[PDB]
Swiss-Prot record, chain A:
Source superkingdom: Eukaryota
Organism annotation: Saccharomyces cerevisiae (strain ATCC 204508 / S288c)
CDD domains: Ribosomal_uL14
Main location: cytoplasm
Taxonomic lineage: Eukaryota, Fungi, Dikarya, Ascomycota, Saccharomycotina
Protein's recorded name: Large ribosomal subunit protein uL14A
Location relative to the cell: Cytoplasm
Curated annotation (Swiss-Prot), chain D:
Positions of GTP binding: G30, Y31, P32, N33, V34, G35, K36, S37, D76, T77, P78, G79, I80
Residues of the full protein shown: 145 to 288 of 647
Family: Belongs to the TRAFAC class OBG-HflX-like GTPase superfamily. OBG GTPase family. NOG subfamily.
Gene name in the database record: NOG1
OBG-type G domain: residues covered: 24-144
Protein name: Nucleolar GTP-binding protein 1
Subunit structure: Associated with nucleolar and cytoplasmic pre-60S particles. Directly interacts with RLP24.
Species of origin: Saccharomyces cerevisiae (strain ATCC 204508 / S288c) (Baker's yeast)
Swiss-Prot record, chain E:
The protein's name: Ribosome biogenesis protein NSA2
Principal localisation: nucleus
Organism for this UniProt entry: Saccharomyces cerevisiae (strain YJM789)
GO biological process: one example: rRNA processing
Cell compartments where the protein resides: Nucleus, Nucleolus
Encoding gene (name): NSA2
Compositionally biased residues, Basic and acidic residues: 1-39
Curated annotation (Swiss-Prot), chain F:
Function: GTPase required for 60S ribosomal subunit export to the cytoplasm.
Extent of Basic residues compositional bias: 1-13, 21-34
Region feature (Disordered): 1-36
Family of the protein in this entry: Belongs to the TRAFAC class YlqF/YawG GTPase family.
Extra information: Present with 7130 molecules/cell in log phase SD medium.
Subcellular location per the Swiss-Prot or TrEMBL entry: Nucleus
Name this polypeptide is given: Nuclear GTP-binding protein NUG1
Domain notes: In contrast to other GTP-binding proteins, this family is characterized by a circular permutation of the GTPase motifs described by a G4-G1-G3 pattern.
Length: 136, 234, 191, 144, 217, 36
RNA sequence: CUAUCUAGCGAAACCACAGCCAAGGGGGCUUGGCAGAAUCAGCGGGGAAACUGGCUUGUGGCAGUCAAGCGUUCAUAGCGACAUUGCUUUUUGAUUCUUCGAUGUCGGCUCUUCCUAUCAUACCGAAGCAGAAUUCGGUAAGCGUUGGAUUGUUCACCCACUAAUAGGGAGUGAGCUGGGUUACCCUACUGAU
RNA sequence: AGAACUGGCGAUGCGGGAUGAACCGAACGUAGAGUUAAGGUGCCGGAAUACACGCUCAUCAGACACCACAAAAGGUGUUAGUUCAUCUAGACAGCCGGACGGUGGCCAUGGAAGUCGGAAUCCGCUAAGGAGUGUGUAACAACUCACCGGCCGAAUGAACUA
């Protein structure tokens, strides 16, 4: 979470383990992300560290630019593609699963965003909400 | 009480204990003094200063001023009529009650009895006494003299001594920056009251020899007359 | 060395009266009364007459007789605590944050209430024991006075009170602030 | 022994102040007991005692301040005596190497005053001994 | 920070209200508490506490001794100047799948090997000399001037309890050894240079890998 | 509290007869030394 | 589908006796804890290779310096504690593919439970501990202690996360890895009359 | 470890040792009565909660066979001793006073004044007061012992053993 990361986190569904490739929505030139780790987890015997929306994750890049590929960096989840629950009653999900990059203090690296983003993520984090064109 | 005793503090100091050798030494030495000198004076001196005694001794070298422990001085003088170096000494061994102290002269009586009335110094309260002044300490910065001299030239008191002022001296002493301050004025004492030990100590801490010092005497003996004399002069 | 008989003297003054059944004491004087059980201590008491009472032990071990001297001094402390009464004086010093100190009564509880400690919001209450009274200092800044007959109650209450402000995890040489005792006197002044 | 010596230097280095020498700084050097403590107090929240004795300040004291929407540091020296420039105590030596190293203005706290009652010949010969190290220093005297 | 800052705060404020009383009282309480620890500390801590307490005691005994002591009242040349002073004792170890091809013996003890070893092949060898347990150096002390110098072995002439351990080179107690003297550099009659002397070892190599030897003088 | 394990005070015979045999070894060593 | 129950048919293996547990005795005896008729279904833990002698633990050897004391005497006839000087494979935060020829076995994953000598978590003490953070030390084992990549000699590992990613016993001599030399009887347990 | 002698066990039961290859006692036909060994006598368990001198009170004592291994010692727990020291010509505890002058002794330093620190160990008056234990301020100052002396009057203290 760290400096900048605002608020608390509600319990949302933990769809994405480590090692699920997802797309990237910013205008850095990075195409896709590959998670290697999640931050702020617990631990349970032979659990995988599970990722969700609204989470700041340690993750590498596979396709993209040569400068940013294949090195671990902080990333926010924005799109799940597995069904989660709102507290105002509805269940929902996106077409495909997606996350963006940013620094450890939560500040955005790119200058744009594609596609819709998570409401809880944009509420929890300022800067994706600053760079967000689309939410829900 | 073989165990669970106190441990008395051991050190490596230089001075060692005297014992009976010095006791009997001074005993025989005053007994040597007795036949040698002629005029004998018993000196009650309760408050005493080392430089005052040395001042008196270097004033009068033809005299000899001796001090030592009381009961051995009574011994060497002789306490009974039955045991005494010379006669008519037991009766004046009775009276010598206070801190004594003794002199062996051959000079006149008149010169000394006027000397010790002329001889006056300045000393401290030494309580169970009066001190001929009162002291209010003002509700400001506190100083080494305690309001005696002007406030420009007195030096404020050191920040080391203040917890002693809070503990021993019973006084509220509150610490602003590096000098020391008080919030209410503090009167320490009045005239015409017997000074207490904390009162004596605070005037000591201010460093005030406000009390007069003069020695009294009670009596006199002469060897050649072999007669006792009683004189209360202060 | 198994001392056979040990003994001490305690001095009753003219004003005060004392009633001792078996190992119970009551001590009554002008300021009031006190009581104390001493059944755990296994000694003997005796009057001779009315200004002096004798405590004693027969067949004493070291522990037994050290207890004898102790019990004398305890009873003397009670005697002083009636005829004089005891009086303990504290001050509550701060660098940045003034204490708000108060007295309250919750169903007759006589709690002592401190706030603004080190910029806290916390209320801390301390009880008052029976038999002891408070006064905040009139015409003296940042000072409180306690007075009572039970010396043990007084000291326990104030020792509690400075034990409350045991400021924690912080360098004592810097945080000189706290509430502490100025001195332990009697009430009287004169005597 | 050397580890305990290093324990003491650990302690002292932790007590050392924080300086970036690269940045906009104002060295303040003067004679002892001239009113530098009053000066730094009046510009800056730093309560150094003003008391009239020889070695009052023993090490390098900082006060940060601001003017015209800028940030400045002000670095006052413990004060200097002659010790004439051949061999010297480390206090004046670190003051000298501070003059030597830090690239910012230097300020002389002159006492054209009745106080600081060392004589003006002492003051000016001290100044004359520190003339050669005023090469590139942007020296600025002020009378107090 | 930045300064003699706590000392400054002490100078300006007095280091607490109640510090002196507590320090006094603590050193009062230490008498009882040290003995409480002397009776408590079930295990290893009574040991260290006692050892430590014995040490401070004996040092205070030295203090009184040196106080009383205060109270009561080498022909070397120049170039050496400026120096600071079978059926038993054998386990048949059957090797291979079919345990009848034993053929094997192992040395489990230290040895000096010499400069050139020219180690024989595997099939003809019977005894196995491992690699680690090979001392080139040993500490030789001098009886005179008690100087400890860390010098090489050249050879082992004598080994007790066998003529075999002589040639093998085992370095146990009782083994006399051919020791270099190169840095000491004594001038003998004729002005020769010494390269070999005799030393007697005084410690087991197994219990410690150091090898102390007294130089035979 | 959690009141922890004790050692016994039980006899545990092997240690008794080990003590006796050890004792005789000690006294034997004493006699071997005692001529000096 | 069996397992289960019922109508009918109907064996065998195996069997000294039979059975409740801990410590002790260099399954039964001794001392103790409990045990209430008779019994059903699951169960897989059992069923005529690990202290010589209180083993083991944190503090080198050898030669010296004091010697507390010991030697019934001797101090160097002689012992001798605690300390302390003596280098110990490269003295200036210069620095070796020392994991290189060991034919030797040891290395690894789920789950119980225990100990504490605590890695965090709780409370405390001292530390130049301004604070935040952090080092030592005390009580304390109630709870907790992660996911991956890896072998002609991984050797001890890196990667990250986590408040932390502490240590050992009794363990699979029943499943798995190497260059590799009648679990059907009763027992107790869990459920049930 | 090796020898030499001797005794036990082996072929052998019984009492006690809580139980038992090695311990302690003990000459095995069946029965009665009596007395005892070694071991024990709070209850199990037959026998005195016997008598008597002492010491011990463990925050997991000990009930041990013993010299024996951790072991030499620590310990303000406790009892008894030994050897020394002090004293109503005033012991120890304490409370009170003095605790000085040359002197701020020499370098040493920015500052060093009995105490940042190196080395010196004086005399003077002295009842006694160090070229000076310990807190100490930047130095100085102030306070305390070690040393004497005033009040009290009574035995006390160092070391060592067990």
């Amino acid at each position: 979470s760290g400096n900048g990361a605002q608020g608390t986190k509600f319990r949302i569904s933990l769809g994405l383990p480590v090692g699920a490739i997802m797309n990237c929505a910013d205008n850095s030139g990075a195409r896709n992300l590959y998670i290697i780790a999640v931050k702020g987890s617990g631990s349970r015997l032979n659990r995988l560290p599970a990722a969700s929306l609204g989470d700041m994750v340690m993750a590498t890049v596979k396709k993209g630019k040569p400068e940013l590929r294949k090195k671990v960096m902080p990333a926010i989840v924005v799109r799940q593609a597995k069904s989660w629950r709102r507290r105002d009653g509805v269940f929902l999900y996106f077409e495909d699963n997606a996350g963006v990059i940013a620094n450890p203090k939560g500040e955005m690296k790119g200058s744009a965003i594609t596609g819709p983003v998570g409401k809880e993520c944009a509420d929890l984090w300022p800067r994706v909400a600053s760079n967000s064109g689309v939410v829900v | 009480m073989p165990r669970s005793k106190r441990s008395k503090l051991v050190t490596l100091a230089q001075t060692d204990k005297k014992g009976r050798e010095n006791k009997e030494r001074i005993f025989d030495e005053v007994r040597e003094a007795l036949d040698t000198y002629r005029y004998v004076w018993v000196l009650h001196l309760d408050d005493v200063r080392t430089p005052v005694l040395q001042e008196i001794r270097t004033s009068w070298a033809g005299s000899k001023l001796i001090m030592g422990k009381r009961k051995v001085l009574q011994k060497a003088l002789g306490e009974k009529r039955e045991e005494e170096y010379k006669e008519n000494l037991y009766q004046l061994s009775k009276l010598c009650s206070g801190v004594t102290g003794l002199l062996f002269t051959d000079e006149d009586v008149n010169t000394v009895k006027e000397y010790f009335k002329s001889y006056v110094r300045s000393d401290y309260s030494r309580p169970n006494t009066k001190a001929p002044l009162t002291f209010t300490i003002p509700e400001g910065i506190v100083y080494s003299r305690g309001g005696q001299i002007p406030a420009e030239e007195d030096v404020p008191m050191i920040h080391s001594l203040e917890p002693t002022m809070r503990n021993k001296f019973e006084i509220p002493t509150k610490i602003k920056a590096g000098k020391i301050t008080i919030d209410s004025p503090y009167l320490v004492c009045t005239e015409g009251e017997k000074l207490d030990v904390r009162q004596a100590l605070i005037l000591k801490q201010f460093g005030i020899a406000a009390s007069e010092f003069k020695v009294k005497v009670s009596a006199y003996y002469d060897n050649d007359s072999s007669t006792v004399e009683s004189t209360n002069i202060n | 060395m198994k001392y056979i008989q040990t003994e001490q003297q305690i001095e009753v003054p003219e004003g005060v009266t004392v009633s001792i059944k078996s190992r119970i004491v009551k001590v009554v004087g002008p300021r009031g009364t006190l009581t104390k059980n001493l059944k755990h201590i296994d000694v003997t008491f005796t009057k001779v007459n009315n200004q002096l009472i004798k405590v004693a032990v027969h067949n004493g071990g070291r522990k037994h007789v050290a207890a004898l001297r102790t019990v004398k001094s305890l009873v003397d402390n009670m005697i002083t605590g009636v005829t004089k009464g005891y009086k303990y004086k504290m001050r509550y010093v701060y660098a940045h944050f003034p204490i708000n100190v108060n007295i309250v009564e919750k169903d007759g509880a006589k709690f002592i209430e401190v706030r603004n400690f080190l910029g806290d919001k916390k209320i801390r209450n301390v009880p008052v024991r029976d038999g002891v009274t408070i006064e905040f200092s009139t015409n003296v800044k940042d000072e409180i006075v306690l007075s009572g007959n039970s010396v043990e109650d007084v000291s326990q209450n104030a020792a509690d009170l400075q034990q409350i402000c045991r400021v924690r995890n912080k360098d004592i040489r810097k945080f000189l602030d706290g509430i502490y005792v100025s001195h332990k006197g009697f009430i009287t002044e004169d005597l | 022994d050397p580890l305990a010596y290093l324990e003491q230097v650990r302690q002292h280095i932790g007590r050392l102040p924080s300086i970036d020498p690269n940045t906009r700084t104002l060295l303040i050097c003067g004679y002892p007991n001239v009113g530098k403590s009053s000066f730094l107090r009046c510009i800056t929240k730093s309560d150094v005692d003003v008391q009239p004795y020889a070695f009052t300040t023993k090490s390098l004291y900082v006060g940060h301040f601001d003017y015209k929407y800028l940030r400045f540091q002000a670095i006052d020296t413990p004060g200097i005596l002659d010790r004439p420039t051949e061999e010297m105590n480390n206090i004046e030596m670190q003051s000298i190497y501070a003059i030597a190293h830090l690239r910012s203005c230097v300020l002389y706290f002159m006492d054209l005053s009745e106080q600081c009652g060392f004589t003006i010949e002492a003051q000016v010969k001290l100044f004359h001994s520190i003339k050669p190290l005023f090469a590139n220093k942007s020296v600025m005297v002020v009378i107090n | 920070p930045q300064n003699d800052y706590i000392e400054r705060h002490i100078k300006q404020h007095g280091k607490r209200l109640d510090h002196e009383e507590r320090k006094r009282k603590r050193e009062a309480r230490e008498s009882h508490k040290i003995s409480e620890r002397a009776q408590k500390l079930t295990g290893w801590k009574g040991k260290q506490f006692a050892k430590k307490r014995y040490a401070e005691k004996v040092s205070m005994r030295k203090k009184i001794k040196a106080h009383e002591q205060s109270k009561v009242k080498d022909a070397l040349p120049t170039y050496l100047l400026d120096r600071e002073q079978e059926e038993e004792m054998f386990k048949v170890i059957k090797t291979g799948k079919s345990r009848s091809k034993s053929w094997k013996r192992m040395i489990t003890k230290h040895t000096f090997v010499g400069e050139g070893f020219t180690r024989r092949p595997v099939k003809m060898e019977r005894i196995i000399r491992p690699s680690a347990l090979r001392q080139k150096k040993a500490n030789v002390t001098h009886p005179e001037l008690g100087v400890t110098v860390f010098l090489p072995i050249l050879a082992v002439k004598k080994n007790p309890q066998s003529p075999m351990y002589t040639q093998l080179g085992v370095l146990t107690k009782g083994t006399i050894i051919e020791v270099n003297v190169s840095e000491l550099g004594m001038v003998t009659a004729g002005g020769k240079v010494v390269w070999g002397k005799y030393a007697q070892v005084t410690n087991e190599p197994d219990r410690d890998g150091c090898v102390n030897a007294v130089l035979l003088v | 509290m959690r009141v922890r394990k004790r050692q016994s005070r039980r006899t545990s015979t092997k240690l008794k007869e080990g003590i006796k045999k050890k004792a005789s070894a000690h006294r034997k060593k004493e006699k071997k030394m005692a001529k000096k």
